[PDB]
């Protein structure tokens, strides 16, 4: 489960609300430590 | 992250050629649906 926000004002109105920067936890090499990462995903990959 | 400024991803088809190609197809479909009929195209309906 991962948290996301929209982008800029981006007032072009073609790309408004499209790119969805997200952040989540993800397991590293060692088993009992955690790694925090930032990425983004197009609008047809996430569902609230 | 995205460096620069964002647009859409788009495709171009030359309008003078694509008019001629639909003109050649619609002369051929008259042999299968009667000569006196006024052929109309449309968009896709729906689904996935």
């Amino acid at each position, epitope marked *: 489960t991962l948290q996301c*926000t*929209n*982008y*800029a*004002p*981006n*007032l072009l109105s073609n790309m408004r609300g499209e790119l969805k*920067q997200c952040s989540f936890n993800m397991t590293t090499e060692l088993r009992d430590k955690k790694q*925090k990462v930032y990425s983004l995903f197009y609008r047809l990959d996430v569902v609230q | *992250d*995205i*460096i*620069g*400024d*964002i647009r859409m991803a788009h495709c171009n088809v030359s309008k003078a050629t694509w008019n001629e190609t639909l003109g050649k197809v619609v002369k051929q479909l008259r042999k299968h649906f009667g000569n006196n009929t006024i052929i109309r195209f449309a968009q896709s309906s729906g689904g996935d």
Partner: antibody, heavy 123, light 108 residues
Framework: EVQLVETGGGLVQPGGSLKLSCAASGFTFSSYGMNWVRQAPGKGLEWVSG????????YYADSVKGRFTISRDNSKNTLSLQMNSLRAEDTAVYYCAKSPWGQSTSFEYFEFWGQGALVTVSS | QTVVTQPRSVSVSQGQTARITCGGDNIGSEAVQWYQQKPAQAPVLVIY???ERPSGIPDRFSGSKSGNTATLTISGVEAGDEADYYCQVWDSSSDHPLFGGGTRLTVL
């Protein structure tokens, strides 16, 4: 060694203009969205005048809105801010900033600061 | 509009702990920085995204976002860490960066 060098004028009467310049002989400056903040010798901070890494958005605050501009010329590592109205004095110092995302907002911070903050006073 | 209040100039003296609290309206939208700054100096980032710190800062600084009021908890003192601290919690509905107030820290 990643730093910011600055030029800035002062003592401009309240009917003229002023142009500030922040330059960066450090990092790869073609990708990061630089910003501006202000501070009177007094209360605290106040935000103005953001931009992306292409010069295509350039959004502003609600107290300087529709009154100033931001130029951004790449390929020679130069930001150009141009204050042009100069209303009755909110005498404040100005800081040059850097945000390690580029392109946008929605959680943004500031790594390295430029601390060149010469003041508009209009005496 | 939307205020971010924090106490004016709290000062403990050699207790080796200090809790500069913050808060206001809807936190749960990234109470995000604290931004230590010393007089006639440059502001320096100290803690980003309220759990980690950048490389080059000693681990006397520690933040936590609890409920609706986040806070910064420093544990330990120094004769060169008397400075000013303030939140940067906002980005919504309006101008996205919005600093809030100030807080002076002195030890005796």
């Amino acid at each position: 060694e990643v730093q910011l060098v600055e030029t800035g004028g002062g003592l401009v009467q309240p009917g003229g203009s002023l142009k500030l310049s922040c330059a960066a002989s450090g990092f790869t400056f073609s990708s990061y969205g630089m910003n501006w903040v202000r501070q009177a010798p007094g209360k605290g901070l106040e935000w103005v005048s953001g931009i992306n890494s292409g010069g295509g958005t350039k959004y502003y605050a609600d107290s300087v809105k529709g009154r100033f501009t931001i130029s951004r010329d790449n390929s020679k590592n130069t930001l150009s801010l141009q204050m042009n109205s100069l209303r009755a004095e909110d005498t404040a110092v100005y800081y040059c900033a850097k945000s390690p995302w580029g392109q946008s907002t929605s959680f943004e911070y500031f790594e390295f600061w430029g601390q060149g903050a010469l003041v508009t006073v209009s005496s | 509009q939307t205020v971010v209040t924090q106490p004016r100039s709290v000062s403990v003296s050699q207790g080796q702990t200090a809790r500069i609290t913050c808060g206001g309206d809807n936190i749960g939208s990234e109470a995000v920085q604290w931004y230590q700054q010393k007089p006639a100096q440059a502001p320096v980032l100290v803690i980003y995204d309220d759990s980690e710190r950048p490389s080059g800062i000693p681990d006397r600084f520690s933040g936590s976002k609890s409920g609706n009021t986040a806070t910064l908890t420093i544990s330990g003192v120094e004769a060169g860490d008397e400075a000013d601290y303030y939140c940067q919690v906002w980005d919504s509905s309006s101008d996205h960066p919005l600093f809030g107030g100030g807080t002076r820290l002195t030890v005796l």
